[PDB]
DNA sequence: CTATGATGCCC
DNA sequence: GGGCATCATAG
DNA sequence: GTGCATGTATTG
DNA sequence: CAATACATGCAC
């Protein structure tokens, strides 16, 4: 197991295909190759380690969620890569992924209800953020937009016809962004958070470096740096073809 | 203030006046809520006399504040005396109250509330002023706190309603600090939120419940009120000015002199700028393209100079306020408004790295230019504060000034001086504060409570200089 | 085109918007009597005379009660004004506007409807009497606002037409005697097509006879409203004198007749001898007596039957001019047979107080008209009690009476031009019922009309008595 | 001796105040119009006063026969000074001496389910009716406007304008006359017991056109008799022994 | 939202 | 008796 | 299959 | 009623 973990730098719990450990485990390892960036999609987030690949069409695909690269997987999640940002959970181990796709063809167990209790907003995603909270709750303050007026700047800053009216469009996100370095400033950092997770999420390459300037930052802020790493080389590399020996 | 007619009468903006006699002005805006039974409802009344024609006419309009609804329009053919009793009827209907005594309105419950409405120069200095003074500028910025962010629904609000605004907020940071989840807290909620206008869409209006939401509260009250003294500022004058922006510079009556690059203050300024750029705010860097000598009058025997630790501290603020700034000063929370919102108390607030009181400039991308303050604090004994707490004041038992202790700020050993100022010159570097009770804060921030206790010297004109975008 | 009053501000500013068949003028309806739904909402487009701009009038409330409205003006956009009225009209009807003329209502929603927006001094004095278009106007309004059955305005012909459709929908489920769902659906129907106002209370079921009778009455006055109004309408032609227009419209000679002659003396005696004692509250005067010529029914008349009798027939004041165009007509086959008690048909009556409690005189307006017909009874059927079905029950007899207990004797009789005369007193018949209740007096009712003959009018005073 | 004393009154009567009526032969005191006998102001001929109480009000009890042929329905109690409204009071003269100091029977429910209208008074009409229902019909118009109209009546400051105002009335009647050729003699019944309930001298010959007619139409001539002496004498002092 | 009313409670 | 203010309902 | 409008509920 | 917005089956 040890040098499997030591590959992908985190620790792993004990007509499809088993991916991303399963390759050292099948030995398919055996080929420079940065395993920050082994079977990471288009819409993976650093949080999100996939650790099964299914239909191509669709990119459906299963993986390890684990919201802190020094934590343990919070759960087993999915997302079809070519369809959409949603990442649904899909069980609690490997038993309850591959048993969810067979009947589909706990999901939310009790201390997952936990973490939905600690869920303060989905952020598009819809599996929610967890900040640690002090008794003044410094750490997060929510962001002065809804989801969907959200949404809808991001949708009216990808069809912009021009750059100039793109750049246009940006100016509610650069405010939002002043606002993010003010909570920064005030140690909230939890709003940068979902911000910068809404910008990844919307997969325009337009955000990439101003969620690039605050994501990692805040990942920065959040004592995070293994996911700082998958985000910046990912921002490099969230590729349609996602096998490291291609 | 003045008194416009509603454009919403369109058959009737131009050719028609809203009618007024002396204190009474027949006119008179309602709003009512009910979080409890969901009731979200403005209500508008003009009284419309045409300027050609003898005639009279109320106009009404209702709907959900914030979405613009159902209007009407009642012609008299000039009989006056019946409108006006239709005036006060309908007044009576929705308010139980006499038109007449409007000034002497007391609102009753389960009815409608009332609210109350309203050329020779350097050509960097014409660029200053033409950037704080310009009304189209500020115009802007209240449509974009009404349709942008929809922060203003019905429209603006009178000083003495902002006062409402900071008494009922008052109210409610007691209610809060009881923490009780009863009725009380939820008519309380009404009360502000029939004083100060909010658009919700379809959900029901959200309790209000943390602190920091009181706070986002306090900074749209304030940023109003702020609206408020800028609109008044802006009042054009006549007696030949050929150009307004200079009147607009009397009324800031301030003395603002550029600097050369060659100066001494300049360079150490600027080794200042750069050594005092947090390495996390890397979206962008900072230039300076200009630095303004500040010379506000009376302030230099009103200074403590008195007092010890005197620093040369930042104060950054959105492009459009400093033209309060420039003829006001800086000011303290308001003492109607509750002082538990100020996670370090109340006072004024300074910074001692340029890029995080810098991030309140609200530079653009496309509108590069911003401003920074300097002003000179004599802190004196300081009080060292780890966590956030608004009982600051309190706290100094003779003391003048709280330093809230953060994490990463620059070290006594690299300071320099300026004009017997002592000038913490950075770059920022551990501070070796921690706390086994609670968190630590990132960076040092100062605290003072007399604003005589702050003399701004100099104003720095800042390009904020922003990078590579995907 | 008549532009709606309630736009006030354009109201003398604009007119209706047409385009040829459709006119973008529009009055729809709708009821509910389960969930108490009451509701109509008028729409015109009107464009300004002088400048050019288009404008959208809706209105809305209670039909009767003046309502709720909007005035959406468009600076010339007549694409704007077109969009918004047929989005409209969509909205509340899911039907396309052009396609006006093919409409068809549906469930959950409005229905449409269809509106209208050298002589002697005594026959002078008769015309002017019945050709009194400000006294028409006020029979209208009427009509409209004293007696509030047909609030909003008029109909055509067809919509009448379609409100007896719905009468006999409702008659057949009244036959049907079941009061149930069905029955409220047609009740809607009904209304929709048929103004009301109920104020508040719900809109009640239809659930005897008599109320089928009354709203065919009304019905009635709403035909003649129709036609009244239509008939009445003055000529050009350099004329001097329009009444005499009207009075080609009539194309009926009427004659006056001398006090001292025979027969004006037997008809004024026949008048005294037949005047009902249980209407005593007035008396009747011959004023004078109208000679009437109709064109056409003296070859059509039915000379060749016996039973000859002179019967009277009174109406209001004003229905005597289309009556005097027209002559009286008979229960519309479209209109349901069971609401005339002794089948359709036309109705005289050989009481003269009795039919002359038809013409409406007052106190203030003492003066009425009679006319008296020659009708034929042939084979005339004995009927006690009330049978609308009477008309089967003929089978080569030509017409019915109904037996009253009170009438005059045949030795009484006189005679007119050959004509029996069925002159009074009334006095018992001897006939009697023994199983419910025995009809006052008589009344001839005819199912062809060539077996009436108008002989003359009759000019009454109708003379009332003290009153308090 | 109740002969003698139903004789007086040719009708027939069923097996701190003062009795009056009938109980004064009773009382033989009568040692005259009978028809009239303690008949206040806004008594009906279907009401025969029988007990007089406080004067102020004049609240008042008498029998109340629908027609003169039968036995009183039940026994009701006006107070003339107060208003036209007529209250069921019991059964009998002792049930409603006793409420004074039962109310309706299973018979008087029965005679509220042939209740057709209550005519300003309350207490309902019953006519008999054939099987297709001919013997009654609705007026045109609601009592509350027709309250209106004798309000807008009475107000009238002239001749002209009381002309005026007559007509609903004039056409009403106009109805009632059809309604008459038409054997629904009930609604010139209804008509007579409103305008006899409104009390303005205005309608008392009017009213007695009607009113009585429809009680010959009725076969209750001894109804029309009364109600004829009484518009003739409603005065404000009816005491025959004064 | 208008708007209009049953109803009822009060000087 | 007259008038306006909860409830209600329809538009 | 995708705009797209419709039908239903709430508030005003 | 107007007018909104939101779940939903239907024509290019």
């Given at each position: ?246 | ?348 607030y300074f910074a001692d790295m340029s890029s995080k009181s810098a991030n309140y400039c609200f530079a653009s991308r496309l509108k590069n230019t911003g401003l920074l303050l300097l002003s000179?604090?004599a802190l004196g004994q300081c009080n060292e504060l780890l966590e956030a707490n608004p009982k600051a004041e309190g706290l100094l038992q003779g003391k003048h000034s709280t330093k809230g ?66």
């Amino acid at each position: 197991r040890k040098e499997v973990e030591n590959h992908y730098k985190l620790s792993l719990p004990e007509g499809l295909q088993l991916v991303g450990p399963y390759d050292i485990l099948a030995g398919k390892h055996k080929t420079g190759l940065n395993f920050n960036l082994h079977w990471r999609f288009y819409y993976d987030p650093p949080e999100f380690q996939t650790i099964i690949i299914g239909d191509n069409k669709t990119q459906y695909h299963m993986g390890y969620f684990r919201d802190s690269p020094d934590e343990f997987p919070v759960y087993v999640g999915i997302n079809e890569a070519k369809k959409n940002c949603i990442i649904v959970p899909n069980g609690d181990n490997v038993f309850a992924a591959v048993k969810l796709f067979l009947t589909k063809k706990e999901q939310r167990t009790v201390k997952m209800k936990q973490r939905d209790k600690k869920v303060v907003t989905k952020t598009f995603h819809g599996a929610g953020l967890v900040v640690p909270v002090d008794k003044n709750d410094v750490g997060y303050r929510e962001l002065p937009e809804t989801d969907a007026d959200l949404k809808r700047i991001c949708k009216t800053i990808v069809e912009a016809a021009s750059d100039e009216e793109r750049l246009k469009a940006f100016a509610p996100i650069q405010e939002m962004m002043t606002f993010v370095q003010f909570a920064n400033d005030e140690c909230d950092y939890g709003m940068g958070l979902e911000l910068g997770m809404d910008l990844f999420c919307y997969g325009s390459h337009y955000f990439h470096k101003v969620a690039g300037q605050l994501l990692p930052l805040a990942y920065n802020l959040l004592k995070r740096n293994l996911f700082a790493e998958i985000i910046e080389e990912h921002l490099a590399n969230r590729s349609q073809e996602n096998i490291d020996q291609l | 203030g003045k008194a416009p007619v509603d454009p919403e009468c369109t058959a009737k903006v131009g050719k028609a006046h809203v009618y007024c006699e002396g204190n009474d002005v027949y006119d008179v805006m309602l709003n009512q809520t009910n979080l409890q039974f969901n009731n979200n409802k403005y209500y508008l009344i003009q009284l419309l006399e045409d300027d050609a024609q003898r005639n009279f006419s109320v106009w009404m309009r209702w709907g959900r504040v914030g979405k613009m609804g159902q209007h009407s329009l009642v012609a008299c053919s000039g009989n006056l005396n019946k409108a006006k009793e239709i005036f006060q009827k309908k007044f009576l209907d929705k308010t139980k109250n006499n038109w007449e005594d409007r000034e002497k309105f007391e609102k009753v419950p389960g009815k409608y509330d009332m609210l109350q409405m309203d050329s020779q120069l350097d050509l960097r200095v014409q660029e200053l002023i033409k950037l704080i003074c310009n009304v189209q500028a500020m115009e802007e910025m209240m449509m974009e706190m009404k349709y942008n962010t929809k922060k203003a629904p019905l429209g603006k609000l009178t000083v003495a309603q902002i006062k409402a605004g900071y008494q009922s907020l008052k109210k409610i940071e007691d209610c809060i600090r009881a923490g009780q989840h009863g009725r009380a807290l939820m008519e309380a909620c009404n009360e502000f939120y029939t004083r100060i206008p909010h658009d919700f869409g379809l959900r029901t209006p959200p309790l209000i419940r943390t602190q920091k939401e009181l706070s986002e509260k306090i900074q749209l009250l304030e940023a109003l009120g702020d609206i408020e003294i800028a609109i008044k500022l802006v009042k054009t004058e006549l007696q030949s000015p050929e150009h307004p922006l200079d009147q607009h510079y009397r009324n800031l009556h301030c003395a603002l002199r550029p600097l050369d690059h060659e100066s001494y203050e300049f360079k150490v300024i600027s080794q200042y700028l750069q050594s005092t750029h947090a390495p996390t705010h890397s979206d962008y860097t900072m230039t300076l393209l200009d630095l303004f000598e500040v010379e506000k009058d009376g302030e230099k025997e009103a200074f403590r100079e008195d007092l010890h630790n005197r620093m040369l501290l930042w104060h950054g603020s959105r492009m459009s306020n400093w033209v309060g700034i420039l003829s006001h000063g800086l000011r303290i929370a308001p003492p109607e408004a509750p002082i538990t919102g100020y996670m370090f108390g109340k006072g004024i607030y300074f910074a001692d790295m340029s890029s995080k009181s810098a991030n309140y400039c609200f530079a653009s991308r496309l509108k590069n230019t911003g401003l920074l303050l300097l002003s000179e604090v004599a802190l004196g004994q300081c009080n060292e504060l780890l966590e956030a707490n608004p009982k600051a004041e309190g706290l100094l038992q003779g003391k003048h000034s709280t330093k809230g202790l953060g994490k990463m700020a620059p070290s006594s050993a690299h300071f320099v001086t300026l004009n017997g100022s002592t000038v913490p010159l950075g770059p920022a570097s551990d501070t070796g504060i921690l706390n086994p009770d609670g968190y630590t804060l990132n960076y040092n921030e100062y605290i003072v409570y007399n604003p005589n206790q702050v003399r701004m010297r100099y104003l720095l004109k800042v390009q904020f200089n922003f990078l590579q975008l995907w």
